[PDB]
């Protein structure tokens, strides 16, 4: 009724306000910036997965890395010696995400079973066992990310995100503003805000404290699969099944730069930044990964070392590597 | 060289052997999807077997089947359907018996059969509620959903046309074989076993070069 007219008026107000701030685009501003053509190479192959690899996450020490694959396997590796450290047997092989806690004590996993399993690594007994099972989520998990050793946020195709309390096991904040399926998720360094890109073609910056959505961006034509924070905390880039990546600034609330090429018509599955927020690394599903200069919006490198879709990728906190896990069942560390 | 990293590579090789041993018994159970509109008795067929994704495993003639039911997920299908790339077969359920539209099931089959993740995965079609369909078609013409043709109003005729249409939904005919069926049907899991054995033989011939 009148609200529909009111809703349209509010949307028009938002659009006009957004258009007002557009002082300039990254093209003109960054024209006076030197492009990075980096070409990493396989320094280690991490074999031992017998099925598709969807998830990886880098440990905080830039030394260990965890990989979740359809083999019902969550392998904790050693990036240098390649000697596998742990092999956690997941009780639900349909995993779509994993996360390595900042303190290294815990590791996250989750997937079509829409149960966020928090596994405990450092225990008196040698084995690695599951600590908590975060349930009550009517979609499928897509990305878990630890805030501390007791708080984790999980996004699902349940049109909802959630901040939990691993101690009590009960969802303590529900983030429900979207209208499609939330496919990605990433935490700001402050661990006070986080972004989630959904199948609505929209991304959203939320507020873990207040318990309420803060900003919604719409710059894409189809499902979003990846989103990751620019390490300064107030920007984030994202990738969509429409073969395009876009950069957003949370304070500017607008779209800033686009990353696409005419030849590529494939999809995107993971996006991560460099340590300095200069290299935008994105895992396309044309059987290889891509590397851009986010600021200059120019193609700068290809990680073509797989025979299947490059699903997940991550960059160490030390910044001295990048690990890509594709559907070829092989992790690959590049430097 | 190595001081106690020599004892770390030992642990690595031990758990690598454990992974290889698990994969031997992981690639031993034949994986098998299950889909449907929701009114179709996929619940019925899983009940007759000798939240989130539902797992069901069973045995028949020393072949371990593992069925995956996902209809409990009311999410975007184009995001969790690619995880089931390696499934040997897809059991599809369609209810022959027009409560709302049936056309939805036909649209679903086209979205599964012609889906790019299933070009070589056979689909075991399952027309359910055969008894109700036979007792129903007399009371209501088949034209209400099939204006084009209703033909003879006996079950052995109308169901023949529905089956013919569903086969005709095959966007590709070279690879996929739609092992259709009807189902109190006690010989059902045997039919799934025959279809899966045929698919396994076809795959063995394919990677052996004879196809």
């Amino acid at each position, epitope marked *: 009724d009148q609200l529909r007219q009111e809703a349209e008026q509010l949307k028009n107000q938002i659009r006009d306000a957004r258009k007002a701030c557009a002082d300039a685009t990254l093209s003109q501003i960054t024209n006076n910036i030197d492009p990075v053509r980096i070409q990493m190479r396989t320094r280690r192959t991490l074999r031992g997965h017998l099925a598709k690899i969807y998830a990886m996450h880098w440990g905080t020490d830039s030394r260990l890395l965890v990989s979740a694959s359809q083999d019902g396997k969550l392998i904790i590796w050693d990036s240098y010696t390649t000697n596998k450290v742990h092999a956690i047997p997941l009780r639900s092989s349909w995993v779509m995400t994993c996360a390595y806690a900042p303190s290294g004590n815990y590791v996250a996993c989750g997937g079509l079973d829409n149960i966020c399993s928090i596994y405990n690594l450092k225990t008196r007994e040698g084995n690695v066992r599951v600590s908590r099972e975060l349930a009550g989520h009517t979609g499928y998990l897509s990305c878990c990310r630890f805030l501390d050793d007791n708080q984790i946020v999980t996004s699902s195709g349940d049109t909802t995100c959630a901040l939990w309390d691993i101690e009590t096991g009960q969802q303590t904040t529900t983030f429900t503003g979207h209208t499609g399926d939330v496919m990605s998720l990433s935490l700001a360094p402050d661990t006070r805000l986080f972004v989630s890109g959904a199948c609505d073609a929209s991304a959203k910056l939320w507020d873990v404290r207040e318990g309420m959505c803060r900003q919604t961006f719409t710059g894409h034509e189809s499902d979003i699969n990846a989103i990751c924070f620019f390490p300064n905390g107030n920007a984030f880039a994202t990738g969509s099944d429409d073969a395009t990546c876009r950069l957003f600034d949370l304070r500017a609330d607008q779209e800033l730069m686009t990353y696409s090429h005419d030849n590529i018509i494939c999809g995107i599955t993971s996006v991560s930044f460099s340590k300095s927020g200069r290299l935008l690394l994105a895992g396309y599903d044309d059987f290889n990964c891509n590397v851009w200069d986010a600021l200059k919006a120019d193609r700068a490198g290809v990680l073509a070392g797989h025979d299947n879709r490059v699903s997940c990728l991550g960059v160490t906190d030390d910044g001295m590597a990048v690990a890509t896990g594709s559907w070829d069942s092989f992790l690959k560390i590049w430097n | 060289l190595s001081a106690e*990293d020599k*004892a770390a590579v*030992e642990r690595s090789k031990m758990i690598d052997r454990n992974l290889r041993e698990d994969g031997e018994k992981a690639a031993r159970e034949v994986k098998l999807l299950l889909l449907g509109a929701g009114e179709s008795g996929k619940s019925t067929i899983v009940k007759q077997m000798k939240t989130g994704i539902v797992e069901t495993h069973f045995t028949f003639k020393d072949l371990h089947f593992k069925m995956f039911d996902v209809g409990g997920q009311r999410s975007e299908r184009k995001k969790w359907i690619h995880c089931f790339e390696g499934v040997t077969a897809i059991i599809f359920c369609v209810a022959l018996s027009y409560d709302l539209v049936m056309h939805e099931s036909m649209k679903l089959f086209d979205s599964i059969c012609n889906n790019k993740w299933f070009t070589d995965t056979s689909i075991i079609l399952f027309l359910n509620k055969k008894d109700l369909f036979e007792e129903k078609i007399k009371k209501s013409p088949l034209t209400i959903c099939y204006p084009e043709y209703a033909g003879s109003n006996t079950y052995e005729e109308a169901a023949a046309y529905i089956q013919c249409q569903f086969e005709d939904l095959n966007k590709r005919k070279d690879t996929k074989e739609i092992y259709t069926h009807f189902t109190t049907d006690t010989k059902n899991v045997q039919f799934v076993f025959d279809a899966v054995t045929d698919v396994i033989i076809k795959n063995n011939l394919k990677d052996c070069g004879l196809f």
Partner: single-chain antibody
Amino acid sequence: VQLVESGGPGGSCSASGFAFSSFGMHWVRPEKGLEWVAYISSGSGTIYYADTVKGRTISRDDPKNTFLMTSLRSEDTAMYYCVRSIYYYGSSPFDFWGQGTTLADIVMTQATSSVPVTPGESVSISCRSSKSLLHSNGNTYLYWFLQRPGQSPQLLIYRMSNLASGVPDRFSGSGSGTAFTLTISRLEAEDVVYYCMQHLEYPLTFGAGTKLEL
């Protein structure tokens, strides 16, 4: 986390509470000192015996989660100790020392025994080794064990810098090259001899030990 074992002239570890099948196992040897006995790893792949008693036997069973010599040599009259050590990155080998029972290569010299120490004061214990204890990977190998009187040894500082679970944060160890040290800041009554350990080579020599009188 619970190792109890049993045993005893002329002729000749019921582990519980942890995943034995993925842990290495040693043995360690009179009211004088301690020295290495044998070794085994997960899966019974690599077995090192002590040079002094080479070829005279260690053997484990994982389903049973547990066995151990042939000649009653004079030096064999001692108190043998049972330890576990899982070897992966960032682990704490020799973490748990069992109670134990009764019955060339790098060597460490201390010669600093009998240092009298009072509560509340800070104390330091030295440790000199023959060669350098630093593999090329960056790890310095020294496992500062404390032997409280009438009790099994305990790990304080594994790999010469890291601190093991349960140890209060007052303990700390350092020292590079060959000469090492262990430091206690606020000594307490339950902190009353200290034993070094090398791990670069197969023979796990210890060193004499420095008793702290209180």
